[PDB]
Amino acid sequence: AQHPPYCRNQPGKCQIPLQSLFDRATTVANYNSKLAGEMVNRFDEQYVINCHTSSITTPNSKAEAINTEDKILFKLVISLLHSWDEPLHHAVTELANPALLTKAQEIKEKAKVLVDGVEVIQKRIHPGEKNEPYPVWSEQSSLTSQDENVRRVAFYRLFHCLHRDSSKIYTYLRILKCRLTSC
Amino acid sequence: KPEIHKCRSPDKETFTCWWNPGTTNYSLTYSKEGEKTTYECPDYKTSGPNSCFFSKQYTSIWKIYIITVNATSSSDPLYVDVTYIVEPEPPRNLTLEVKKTYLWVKWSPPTMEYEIRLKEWEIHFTGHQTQFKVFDLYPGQKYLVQTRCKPDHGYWSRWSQESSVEMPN
Amino acid sequence: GKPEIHKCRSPDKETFTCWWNPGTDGGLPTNYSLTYSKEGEKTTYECPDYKTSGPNSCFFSKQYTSIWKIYIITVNATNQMGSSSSDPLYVDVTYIVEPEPPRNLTLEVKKKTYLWVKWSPPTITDVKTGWFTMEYEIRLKPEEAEEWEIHFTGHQTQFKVFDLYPGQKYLVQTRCKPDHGYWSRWSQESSVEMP
């Protein structure tokens, strides 16, 4: 019988407003970005990046990002998030054999929560869009190498790339939010 | 007719709905505002009698759930947004320190607004602050103090557990 | 090599500057040159502007600035008795943002009473489009006092303070940080007298 506060508006239906959806997406993305920064730190205070997602071309300056069509921004956020599920799976398996293990499991879970929301928002504004294949890190076996050094460099590349992509995902979601609703 | 009593979520990751007998086997079904597929309660056990528990596998903050209880005579359909039914845990790490002389009260969360009280109690809405100053209290008395918190669009958490402190004689 | 280079900063996440410190030179005049390499482009370029940011500096305008990329920077020194290059400095502009202080600080009062502080980000930082994201802290205290009280306000540009002691005058300052950089200096103080 009861409904949520905002459904207290004329439209006969009752869907979550687009504004509320973008709010939730940017705060989840903000959270993953904090976690990634934490892993980057803890790892640098105890032990050239060539990220596998570099093949996905992105706008890296303000002029160009602001000019990007909304259809392409969505596509870039969704494939970047899809691309990290496997590498994280492999990392978590290695670290399972302290703190790293715990944040790795959380970011992997929240990245899946976040892509779900980004697909819902995308299908709401552009019905019938389809998402294409995303890149793979083939050298991900190095995270379990018996050689101590090659292993340390594997994790270095992993946390720093994870930090950079969390940051792009969050900036692109803020741009779309400011453009399609309210900043 | 059966009626839905209340649904609650402690962390936006899982939630539980409770109901009250109609007058009989009780079942609970739902659907999402999005699609036209119907579903049945995924668990009548872990939350005790007359309830339905939704684990992480069945909880989403991206859609509205349309819930209805049946008795064999449906109930009035209920609309749920997991982000508006959060009822947290009391604030934690409550510390009290004496500092002319005022009581410095400090806590940590379990954004949120807060409320502290000290003795028939003197309530103090504190907003988003996580520290609070209280002046002009009685010298030579033990004081009881508790805290509460509430999400952006939630329900109040129960009162924390008492902490005491004594104002200099 | 001797000459050193360790610090670079960006005020807006659109441009940036680096500085170098000369080393052993033996008393003879030495000419310095900065050259750099950018991730993704196998090319070495020369510093694009040695004037704008002053002596022993290099300024990278918007045409030369891209984030989410590591720049490899080295400083070279040459005199009639030899040449020496610094160790390479690895820098990702994404993490060297150090903004200017918040501006336009205003205090308004409020039955029950409370203080409502309001302010805005530096003009240079583009928060309106969502390119830049900022975090804020406010600190206040009575003029006749020795300790400040700090409150972290997240992304909000206004805050409601509830535990101010009636009768006194209060001083308030604010500061901001990008999501991942350095805190700015504290803004200039504003005053208010509680009812």
**Cα angle, residue B34 at apex, residues B69 and A118 outer, rounded to 5°:** 130
Interface test with chain B among C162, C168, C170, by most B beta carbons within 10 Å: C162
State the number of CA atoms in the 13 A half-sphere of B111 facing the CB.
Answer: 12
CATH number at residue A103: 1.20.1250.10
Cα→Cα distances B60→A116, B13, B110, Å: 9, 8, 22
């990290």: which residue's tokens? A84
Cβ-count burial of A6 within 10 angstroms (0-12 exposed, 13-18 middle, 19+ buried)? middle
Cβ-count burial of B116 within 10 angstroms (0-12 exposed, 13-18 middle, 19+ buried)? buried
Which residues lie across from C135 on neighbouring strands? C177
Q: Are A37 and A103 in contact (CB under 8 A)?
A: no
Cβ of C128 within 8 Å of Cβ of A66? The answer is: no
| C39, C126, C179: residue with CB nearest A62 | C126
Question: What SS3 class is residue A65?
Answer: helix
Q: Are B69 and B25 in contact (CB under 8 A)?
A: no
Neighbours of A166 (CB within 10 A): 25
Amino acid at A176: L
Which residues lie across from C84 on neighbouring strands? C77
d(CA C195, CA C192): 9
Residue-range definition of the domain harbouring residue A143? 1-183
The C-alpha of A116 sits at a distance from chain B's nearest C-alpha, in angstroms, of 8
d(CA C185, CA C182): 10
Cβ-count burial of C48 within 10 angstroms (0-12 exposed, 13-18 middle, 19+ buried)? middle
d(CA B126, CA B134): 11
| CA-based nearest residue in chain B for residue A123 | B34
Interface size between A and C, measured as CB pairs under 8 A:
62
First to last CA, chain B: 62
Q: B residues 84-123 near C, CB within 8 Å?
A: 111
Resolution number, Å: 2.3
Neighbours of B85 (CB within 10 A): 21
Structurally, how many domains does chain A consist of? Answer: 1
Which residues lie across from B125 on neighbouring strands? B115
Q: Tell whether residue B152 is among the known ligand binding residues.
A: yes
DSSP letter at B158 equals P
What is the 3-class SS of chain C, one letter each residue? CCCEEEEEEECCCCCEEEEEECCCCCCCCCEEEEEEEECCEEEEEECCCCCCCCCCEEEECCCCCCCCCEEEEEEEEEECCEEEECCCEEEEHHHCECCCCCEEEEEEECCCCCEEEEEECCCCCCCCCCCCCEEEEEEEEECCCCCCEEEEEECCCEEEECCCCCCCEEEEEEEEEECCCCCCCCCCCEEEECC
Interface test with chain A among C66, C96, C131, C156, by most A beta carbons within 10 Å: C131
In chain B the domains, ranked by start, together with CATH numbers, are 1-86 (2.60.40.10), 87-164 (2.60.40.10)
- In the structure encoding, which two tokens stand for residue A180, read together? 């399609």
Cα→Cα distances A8→A156, B61, B92, Å: 50, 19, 35
Q: Which experimental approach was used here?
A: X-ray
- Sorted by sequence, the CB contacts under 8 Å of residue C172 that are 6+ apart come out as C105, C107, C117, C138, C139, C140, C189, C190, C191, C192
d(CA C185, CA A53): 37
Cβ of B128 within 8 Å of Cβ of C161? The answer is: no
If we measure between CA atoms, which residue out of A25, A75, A53, A65 comes closest to residue A160?
A: A53
Amino acid at A112: K
Q: Tell whether residue B11 is among the known ligand binding residues.
A: no
Which residues lie across from B114 on neighbouring strands? B127, B149
Q: Is C160 on the interface with B (CB under 8 A)?
A: yes
Backbone dihedral angles phi then psi of residue C89, each to the nearest 5 degrees: -105, 125
